Amino acid sequence: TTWEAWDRAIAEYAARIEALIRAAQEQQEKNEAALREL
Amino acid sequence: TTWEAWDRAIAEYAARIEALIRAAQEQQEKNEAALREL
Amino acid sequence: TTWEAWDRAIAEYAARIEALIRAAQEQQEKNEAALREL
Amino acid sequence: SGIVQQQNNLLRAIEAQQHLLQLTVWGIKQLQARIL
Amino acid sequence: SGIVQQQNNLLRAIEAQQHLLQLTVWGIKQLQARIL
Amino acid sequence: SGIVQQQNNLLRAIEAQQHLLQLTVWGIKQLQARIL
């Protein structure tokens, strides 16, 4: 429940979101590719 | 507004979002089932 | 970065996000129609 | 239909989350004002 | 699987974004208590 | 295709919200440093 505990949780979820966004990006590429090969 | 009105609004929007997440989660399960034999 | 830059960055991402939502509301309307048609 | 319906839910979540973001911006500015 | 994975990528991102929002609200509340 | 378009629309909005979120984190940190 401290500020440092806040800094840590923020940094944790920032990293997570970023990795999710990258996965969505590289998977948007793949779906689009496949969809224009269909 | 008051800080109390602010708290209430945040709570309300937060409640709306979590229900949308639970709905989307239930949808996700069903969708993933369907997309086996399809 | 400064408070002045911060204000502008926020106004600029907020307006961007409202345009992306308007465009997703549009594409969703069309998606519900074309799904109904198929 | 379940995909289109869910995309609607994801969209409505994003819409609601923008309001929460707007609200947090107000709180930051308010605390700034208190400091003043 | 590709689009339904992407539905899942998107939902998960929104869930992570919600947790980030809760945390920001927490920060504001912490400040508010110390300032107010 | 409209479904894959929509995944892109949602991703883009999530991306932009995250940038916004990171701006609110910056603001809270500026205030935190002050109260301490």
Q: Which of E4, E6, E8, E14 is best to mutate for the D interface (most D CBs within 10 A)?
A: E14
Q: Which of F8, F9, F28 is best to mutate for the C interface (most C CBs within 10 A)?
A: F9
Identify the H or E element spanning B5: helix B3-34
Residue C24 has its nearest CB partner, among F3, F13, F20, at F13
Q: Give the whole-angstrom CA distance, residue D5 versus residue F4.
A: 14
> Look-up: residue for tokens 């603001």?
F27
Q: How many domains does chain F have?
A: 1
Residue E35 has its nearest CB partner, among D10, D13, D31, at D31
CA distances (Å), origin E3, targets A3, A21, D12, D15: 39, 15, 19, 22
Q: Which range of residues forms the domain containing residue C2?
A: 1-38
> Would you give the distance in Å from CA E1 to the centre of its chain?
26
> Look-up: residue for tokens 């500020």?
A3
CA distances (Å), origin F29, targets A3, B8, D24: 10, 24, 13
A3 in helix, strand or coil? helix
Q: How many CA atoms lie within 13 A of A25 on its CB side?
A: 10
The count of CB pairs under 8 A between chains A and E is: 38
Q: Which range of residues forms the domain containing residue D19?
A: 1-36
Identify which of F24, E7, F32 has the alpha carbon closest to the alpha carbon of residue B35. Answer: E7
User: Is there a contact between C6 and F23 (Cβ–Cβ < 8 Å)?
Assistant: yes
Q: How many domains does chain C have?
A: 1
Resolution for this PDB entry, in angstroms: 2.0
Identify which of D20, C17, D12, A18 has the alpha carbon closest to the alpha carbon of residue B27. Answer: D12
**Which residue in B has a C-alpha nearest to residue D24's C-alpha?**
B10
Q: Which region holds residue A24: left if phi is over 0, alpha if psi is between -120 and 50, else beta? A: alpha
Q: Which long-range contacts (CB under 8 A, 24 or more apart) does C17-20 make?
A: C17/D18, C17/F13, C17/F16, C17/F17, C17/F20, C18/D18, C20/F9, C20/F12, C20/F13, C20/F16
Cβ-based neighbour number of residue D5 at 10 Å = 15
Q: Name the amino acid, one letter, at E29.
A: K
B36 in helix, strand or coil? coil
Output the six-digit token pair for D5: 């319906």
> How determined?
X-ray
C13:F23 CB<8 A: yes
Q: Give the whole-angstrom CA distance, residue E5 versus residue B21.
A: 16
Q: Give the whole-angstrom CA distance, residue C31 versus residue A10.
A: 36
